[PDB]
Write a protein that binds this DNA or RNA. Sequence first.
DNA 1: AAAAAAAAAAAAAAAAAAAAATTTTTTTTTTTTTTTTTTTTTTT
DNA 2: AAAAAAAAAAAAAAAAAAAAAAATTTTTTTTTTTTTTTTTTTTT
Lengths: 267, 38, 49
Amino acid sequence: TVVLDDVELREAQRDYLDFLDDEEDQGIYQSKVRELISDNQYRLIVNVNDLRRKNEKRANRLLNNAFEELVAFQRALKDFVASIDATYAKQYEEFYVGLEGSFGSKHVSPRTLTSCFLSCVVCVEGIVTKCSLVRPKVVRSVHYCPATKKTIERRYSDLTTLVAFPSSSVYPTKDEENNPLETEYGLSVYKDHQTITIQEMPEKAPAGQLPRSVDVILDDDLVDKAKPGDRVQVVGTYRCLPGKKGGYTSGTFRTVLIACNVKQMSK
Amino acid sequence: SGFDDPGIFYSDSFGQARKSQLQRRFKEFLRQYRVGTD
Amino acid sequence: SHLVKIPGIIIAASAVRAKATRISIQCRSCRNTLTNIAMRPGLEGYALP
DNA sequence: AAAAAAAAAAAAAAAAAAAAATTTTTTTTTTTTTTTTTTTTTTT
DNA sequence: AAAAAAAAAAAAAAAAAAAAAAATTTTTTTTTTTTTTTTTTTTT
Ligand SMILES: [Zn+2]
């Protein structure tokens, strides 16, 4: 079911390819690309005020509906960093886009992270509370059959937020001939995964009231950027989670904030 | 560590006759039916 | 169900159709196989698991 | 002119295919409670 | 200044909520193959 073309995605990718194209301007984002290529870091931080001034409508669209918009942004980023250096752009299967700037209405606190801001990149200050063990998550798993001298690469899609199916979640262990498959851990590919919990600051929070906190899933690139007790500003995508399969549902949808970036709020 | 499931293994049998022994006696019938007179 | 010996004259002999003695079945979701089940010989059916 | 071969139409039977389908129990998690140790604080 | 008493902390154990986990063939339909019967067309 490969899509032949979509006007929305094509338009958005063109707009952000223009936004990254910085030579007629002062060269700020081109310089950012060049320095991050030199660093080997693979996230580029785009200021929302820059995006708003160059195209307010795209800023409204993105801050109202993130994930597919940022897929467009990141595909544009991959094309752009390939034009600067195809060899480096080939190196990483994805590159990422952090945010920064004046998230005017999109700056709330975990007390005020209502159910109006879903799939919207929200900005939120707060104190960490937990630091779960940063443990791997498998993304592309390679297997070897010694009976048949065979190799396979099962592929996994990061459906941390969408609907996920057992057919997607299968980890193969036997061939079609019921032979034994041995995992190739090194040849496989993994990304770190950590959960943390931001909290409304007690200096900011209401005086007499219980704390309120929000869960934050830091995948790779953001492993140890937040320990307990630290002040941190998290900007990212509040969303819903899928309940695991079962013929019943209550309406409950425990929600998270898949952080797009986190910075030291101490400033 | 829990990413695999290697198969069971077993060994050859060391030690109304059972169906395996009837199998053995059919094998004997085929292997030793001597028809040609001395 | 005991071996019997019978004379007769054949009158109609159907065409040789392929019947399965051992099979394999795949799972539609997990795509794992139950290789080489044994079909009980005769005009004996087989219910799938 | 009578016989018969062919045609279309109608019917029976065997093989394959079609369709129908929630409830009970277990386990993690959260939250408090209680014991006992440790720590701190007040007294002579 | 050190002893006694009290308060708080740390750690183990228990009770309920709510999300997960597991079990799970048989009867009806209907297409296709085969045969059968009445008729028309053709041949002796
Ligand atoms: Zn399966």
